[PDB]
């Protein structure tokens, strides 16, 4: 019924009704950083 990765984490699951298997990919995430020169030069910023 389940699939697991080497890290013992759930990877794939089988549909109980139509017995098909679906991959489980987690939703995206990540850090946010702010780019800026000195405040004494401008107040513009760019984010990554």
């Amino acid at each position: 019924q389940f699939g697991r990765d080497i890290a013992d984490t759930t990877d794939a699951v089988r549909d109980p009704q139509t017995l098909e298997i679906l991959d489980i990919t987690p939703c995206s995430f990540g850090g946010v950083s702010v780019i800026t020169p000195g405040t004494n030069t401008s107040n513009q910023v760019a984010v990554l």
Partner: peptide, 25 residues
């Protein structure tokens, strides 16, 4: 080096690279 490395003679770089070669939740 060789720009596209098209020569039959492989640089030591490729050998070392291949020798070293050989989550979102």
């Amino acid at each position: 080096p060789d720009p596209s490395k098209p020569s039959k003679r492989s640089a030591i770089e490729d050998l070392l690279f291949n020798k070293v070669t050989l989550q979102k939740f």
